[PDB]
Each structure stands twice: as C-alpha cells, then as structure tokens.
Amino acid sequence: MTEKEKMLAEKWYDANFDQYLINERARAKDICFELNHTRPSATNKRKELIDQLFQTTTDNVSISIPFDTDYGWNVKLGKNVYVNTNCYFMDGGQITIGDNVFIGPNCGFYTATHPLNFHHRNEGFEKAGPIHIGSNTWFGGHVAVLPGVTIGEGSVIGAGSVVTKDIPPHSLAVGNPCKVVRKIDNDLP
Amino acid sequence: MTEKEKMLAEKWYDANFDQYLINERARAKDICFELNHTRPSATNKRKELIDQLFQTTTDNVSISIPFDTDYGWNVKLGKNVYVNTNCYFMDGGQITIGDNVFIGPNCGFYTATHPLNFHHRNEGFEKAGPIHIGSNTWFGGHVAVLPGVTIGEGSVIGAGSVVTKDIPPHSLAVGNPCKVVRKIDNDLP
Amino acid sequence: MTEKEKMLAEKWYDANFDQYLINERARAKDICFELNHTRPSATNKRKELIDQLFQTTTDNVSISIPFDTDYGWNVKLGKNVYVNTNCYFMDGGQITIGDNVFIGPNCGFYTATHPLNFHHRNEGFEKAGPIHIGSNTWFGGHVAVLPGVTIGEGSVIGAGSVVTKDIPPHSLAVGNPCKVVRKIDNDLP
C-alpha cells in the first residue's frame, strides 16, 4: 500500500515524507491561499477556486475567508453548506458533510491523530479518523470536532464545544467536552 | 416591517434572501477584505477603512488584522477599544462596546441564532440577540460571547471562556460556561 | 530600567506608550503581514521572513499562515517545530519552545497580563509571564496557554484545552481548565 492508501484505510502513514501527500497538501494550500486573497464579491472566481479545491462541482457551498484544508478532495460535500470565517477542514481522514449544514466561524474539523509516544510521533507518522457531519446540522462558532467523530443529522452543537464523542441525531449538545442537553423536535412545521 | 427592522427588533428575519441585508453584508465584507490586506503601518488608510466599516469617526479604536463583522454599522463603539487579531463582531444584533475595552485575540461576539428545527432553519431565518460590552472591561484570548449577553462594566473575562449568561459588573469570570469567580476592587488607586 | 527590561523581568511595564516597544511590535507586525501574504510554496522567501521575524536561523520550523507574534525575537525555538494555521505567539514574556514540537491550528500562547483594576489597566501597563514548551510535545487545535505556564517535555495537550496551570512531563492533559488525565508511556520503542 502507498502512504495515501494507508491514510484512507485508517492505518499509520508517513504524513511528512511521502512525496505524493506532500505535493497534494501543497496543491491545496496554494489554492486556499488564492481563495483567501480573492475579493469576497468576486463570485465566479471564488466558485472556480472552491470547485478546484474540493475537486467537485459544488451546489451552494458558501466559504467565507479565510479557509483552510489539507487535501480538499477528501472533503465530501452536500448542497447548501454555509461555512463562516476561519474554518479548517483537516481532511487526511475523509470529512463527509451532508446537505443544509450551517458551520459557524472558527470551527476546526480535525481528523489527524499523532502517536502519544514521542519516538513514534517524531518520525511524522499520523493516523486519520474520518469525521461525518449529518445533514440538517448547525454548529455555533469556536467548535472543535475531533478525529473519528460523527454528528447525527438534525443536531445542533453549541458555540465553543469540543466534540470528543459522537452526537446522536436530532440532539442539542454543548460543552467541553460536548454532551447532549436534550432532543430537538424536527417534525415538519 | 422590513427585514432589517425585524433584525433590529429581535424578531425572526429573512437573513439569506433579503436584498438589502445581503447588500449590506457584501459592503462590510469587501471593506474588511481591504482592511485585512492593508499594511499595518498604513495608519491613515486603516483609520479610513475602519471608520467606513463602522460608519463612525472612531477615537482610538485599534483593530489588529484580520478582522470580520457582518454589518459594521451595527457595532457601536466607545473610545479606547483595543481589538487584537482575528476577532469577529457578528453584529446582526447590535454590539455595543463601551470605553476602555481590551479585547484579546480570536474573540467572537456572536449575536446570531438560528431555529433549532431544521425545516425552519433551512429557510435561512435568523433572530439576533444584542451583545452589550461594558466600559472598563478586559477579555482574554479565545473568548466566545453568545447572543443576548451583557458583560458588566469593570469586569474581566478569562481566556477561553464561553459566555452564555450575563456577567455582573466588577467581576472576574472564567470558564466554559463562563462563571463568576470573584469580585474585582476597581476603586481609584 | 527601561520598559523592555521591566517587560523581561516580570515587572509592570508601559506596553502602550514606550516608543522602543511600539517600534519593535511594528517591526514584527510588518514582517508577519508580509509572511501572511507570501505564497505557501515560496519556500525560500518564507524561510527568510521567518528567520527575520524570530531573529534566528531556524532549523525545520514550519509556520503555516496566518501567523502572529508581538516581538518575534522573544520566541526561542528548537528544531523541528511544526506550527499549523492561525497561531499567535504573544511573546512579551519569553516563549521558549523545545525540539520536536507539534502545535495544532488556532493555538494561542499568551504571555500578557493586564491589571485587574481598570484604573491601572486603562493606563496600558502590562506584566508578562513567560511560557515554556518542552521538547517532544503535541498540542491539539484550539488550545490556549496562559501566562507563566510550563508544559513539560513529552506531554500532549488535547484540542480545545485552556492551560491555566503547569503540565508535568510525560502527561496527557485535556480540558478547560486543562487537567492531567494520565501518564504517557514514552519508552523507546
């Protein structure tokens, strides 16, 4: 297996010296740089850059600058995804985002883990834990979502939350660590 | 009522499709973008942009870039307001800031709420809760202030706090959620 | 003593009106601005700017933009220091960073304290508390480290932590406030 294949299979992989992955990160970083330095009202240029970054034809994916991601192609997006300023989709592990998702400012979706033991960590190895973000979700500002976490459809994550464990669907959850407070009634009004 | 009037009256409003509000946000974002790409030592240009953004003649309002706001004209500023890097004044609800206010880096003042029910939320409606920041306050870095919250004059908010409830005057408060720890003696030395 | 000498000796100092300190902050801010607007793949230019900012010849110090610091020369760096996006080394108090240190995105290392009493604070005085970051450490994203704090060698700080007190070596610590969870086995594999 290549290092990319290991990354995508939830195995330890050589994040810092694999030329392929280095080059893919450099690609994404230069696109993010361009995007971050494109006037917000330059709508068509921004859409072109976002589509290049994610290697897809987005449908109402609104990205407020600055934005960051590692690979771009490893973020799978639904339609109607609203991403406020200063978010980071750290996507060595796939980040899957459903439809109708409101992401507040200063949110980090972190898929990278390093070894605890410094001898192994210092060698640059990582293990990626995918994040799944359900459709019909809302994240307040200043939220961090940790590796391997799933947020169920219909749920709301309060500002400042550190989401260390999976959140069931149709739930309001807040805190560090983030805990469910109560259910949400999402029936048709 | 217009959607702007609803926004300012703490009613649900059409944040995503009202052309007036869309256009006002676009104005503020383009000014922020220019400010964020202006050399920090270009004093006069930065003052001009800040005054254009807030639609006021500021008196020692120091904004360290990057900075973000939604409307600009809905942030009411005293004198001697020091805003460190990467703050966001999300001002659909009025953000009122007193005199002599020290705001740390990476602070978010969030006035927006969305409906909890996804069917209503997906339609883009919001409800804004004003934030009032007393004079003579200090906020550490990485603070989030939530909708409708008031921070009393003379108070200090510890780094990393998530301010979910009003903070009395002359108080030190820390945490997620932010809680008063003790009183501050602000008597004249 | 000059105000710089007071700053470095953990005494109250005139942070806002001392011309030397003002000028040194301006130097660092203009370099950061240039760095933050340099294409990420412009390796040589970035290295030159980083080395000018820190006034040292760095050895595998990787800075992902945006980055911020106050003085730059008051950050003492080891080799193999990896700093992800949107960090701020607020370095009126010295920030000492060891070798083989992984710093996640949106981390703030804050050495500045202000007076609690607003009359003294409004005069602009500060007191700086150095931060020491041991070798062989890993910080998740969204971490704040407060003034005077030391993180021991071999330790890991979970994402979202607010590090208010010193962390012993070879420890895993998480939370707001950040608390040791358990020891890390760092034995040579």
Ligand SMILES: CC(C)(COP(=O)(O)OP(=O)(O)OC[C@H]1O[C@@H](n2cnc3c(N)ncnc32)[C@H](O)[C@@H]1OP(=O)(O)O)[C@@H](O)C(=O)NCCC(=O)NCCS
């Ligand atoms: C999601 C949100 C609306 C939930 O707030 P709510 O619906 O009013 O929540 P509740 O009424 O159930 O919770 C009240 C209690 O939970 C606590 N709480 C609420 N939100 C909290 C949060 N984000 N973090 C920690 N505690 C929180 C309060 O301290 C309060 O405690 P109490 O028993 O002492 O009164 C809110 O947390 C939020 O994220 N608002 C910020 C909005 C924002 O980030 N802006 C928009 C960008 S997407």
Ligand SMILES: CC(C)(COP(=O)(O)OP(=O)(O)OC[C@H]1O[C@@H](n2cnc3c(N)ncnc32)[C@H](O)[C@@H]1OP(=O)(O)O)[C@@H](O)C(=O)NCCC(=O)NCCS
């Ligand atoms: C506001 C601040 C100075 C208060 O600190 P302080 O006056 O020394 O606080 P106290 O001694 O009263 O509080 C001590 C206790 O509260 C806790 N505490 C203090 N600050 C805290 C914070 N920001 N978050 C959570 N807990 C905190 C400590 O863990 C400690 O626990 P202990 O009882 O086990 O000792 C500090 O929280 C702060 O924000 N420092 C960072 C400054 C900063 O962000 N830089 C400048 C940018 S504006």
Ligand SMILES: CC(C)(COP(=O)(O)OP(=O)(O)OC[C@H]1O[C@@H](n2cnc3c(N)ncnc32)[C@H](O)[C@@H]1OP(=O)(O)O)[C@@H](O)C(=O)NCCC(=O)NCCS
């Ligand atoms: C450092 C880190 C790996 C520790 O996670 P871990 O090794 O699985 O640690 P543990 O097994 O001790 O954690 C399990 C428990 O701790 C809690 N916990 C874990 N990380 C936490 C955090 N950052 N904040 C608060 N609580 C946390 C969980 O809520 C869980 O509680 P439980 O008893 O109910 O199960 C992780 O916190 C982390 O920072 N991950 C994010 C990585 C990141 O930021 N990306 C890379 C950039 S540097």
Ligand SMILES: [Cl-]
């Ligand atoms: Cl938002």
Ligand SMILES: [Cl-]
């Ligand atoms: Cl491990």
Ligand SMILES: [Cl-]
């Ligand atoms: Cl500050």
Ligand SMILES: [Cl-]
């Ligand atoms: Cl609601």
Ligand SMILES: [Cl-]
């Ligand atoms: Cl990282």
Ligand SMILES: [Cl-]
């Ligand atoms: Cl004091």
